[PDB]
Structure 1
C-alpha cells in the first residue's frame, strides 16, 4: 500500500491537509482530508504539473496532463490526469474532501508524487463552461492554496 500527503497553504486564509492512499499500483487512489477558509460552493481541485512553489502556487504550472488530453471532470474519459473536479465548502467555510479516482496514481505511471495539489477560487466547470478556457483550465480562477504531494508513512 502507498500513501501520500499534501499540506495546502497560500497567501490568504485557505489551508488544508489532503491524504492519498492506494492499495495497489493498478488500483484507485482514495483522497481524503479537510480544507478551511473557503467561500461556500464549488472550488476547482487539481494536480498541477510541477512541485515548484518558488513563487507560490503560480510556479506549479499547468494541469498535470501527461496524455495530452483536454480538460474535463474526474468521471470523464476526456480529462487531464490532474482533473479531480471540485471540492465543496458549506457556509462554515470548510470542505470535507472524500474522492476516489482511478486515473491519478501514487506508483507505476501517471504518478502525482512531487507534483502540486491546488484548490481554486471558483468552480471548475469540468469543460462544460461554453468557452475555449473551459476545455483548458475549467475557468476555476485564482489558486487559493497549494502544496507539493509528498510520500507518507
Structure 2
C-alpha cells in the first residue's frame, strides 16, 4: 500500500533497481529487485542517513541510525535501522534481492524515504568482525553504487 523505489548507480557500471513495499505502517517492508555489475559474493547493503548524492555516494553519510544503536545484521535487535545486511552476486555479477524487514518503514521515524541506499565493495560482517569498525560500518568497504529512495506510484 506504500511503494518506494531506488535506482542504484555507480562505476562499473554497478547498477540496480530496488523496490520497497509496505502493506500497513505497522507491518514489514518487502524489498526486491536486482543489481548487476558486482563481483561474486557478499556486498553490504545499507540505508545511509542522507539522501545527498551531490558528491556521489560519500555525501550519504553514515548508516541510518535514528535510534542510536550499534551496527548489526538485519536479524539482530542491536542494529541500525539502515542495516539490511548483504546482497549476494552470482558469477555473472548479478544480485537478485529479496528481503523482508520489520525495522525499516515507509512511514514514521523509521522511514527511509529521502535517504540513500548503498551497495558496498565487500561483505558486511554484521557487527561480528571483532574490531571497532565492525560495530559502526560492518567493514563493508567502499560504496559501489547508491541512489536516493523515492516515492513510487
Q: When the two structures are superposed, what TM-score results if normalisation uses the length of structure 2?
A: 0.99
Partner of 2:76: 76
Aligned-pair distance for 1:13?
1.3
Deviation at 1:109, TM superposition (A): 2.6
**Is the contact made by 2:114 and 2:149 (CA closer than 8 Å) also made in structure 1?**
yes
Number of aligned positions between the proteins: 153
Structure 2: unaligned runs, 5 residues or longer: none
Q: In the aligned structure 1, how far is the partner of 2:143 from the partner of 2:131?
A: 20
Corresponding residue number in structure 2 for 1:141: 141
After TM superposition, give the deviation of residue 130 of structure 1 in Å.
1.2
1:8 to 2:8 alignment: yes
Q: Which moved more, 1:120-129 or 1:8-17?
A: 8-17
For residues 90 and 36 of structure 1, the distance between their equivalents in structure 2, rounded to whole angstroms, comes to: 10
Q: Distance in 2 between matches of 1:39 and 1:101?
A: 25
Instruction: State the Cα distance separating 1:10 from its structure 2 match.
Output: 1.3
**What is the rounded CA distance, in whole Å, between the counterparts of 1:121 and 1:5 in structure 2?**
22
Q: Could you state the TM-score of these two structures normalised by the residue count of structure 1?
A: 0.99
Residue 63 of structure 1, CA deviation: 0.2
| Inter-partner Cα distance in structure 2 for 1:109 and 1:29 | 14
- Give 3-state SS (helix, strand or coil) of 2:5's partner: strand
CA RMSD of aligned residues (A): 0.5
Secondary structure of the structure 1 residue equivalent to 2:71: coil
Q: Deviations over 1:6-26 (max 9, x none)?
A: 000013310000000000001
1:34-69 Cα shifts (integer Å, max 9, x gaps): 000000000000000000000000000000000000
Counterpart-to-counterpart distance in 1, 2:103 and 2:116:
16
Residues in 1 aligned to 2:104 and 2:53: alpha-carbon distance in whole angstroms: 21
Q: Report SS of the residue matched to 1:8.
A: strand
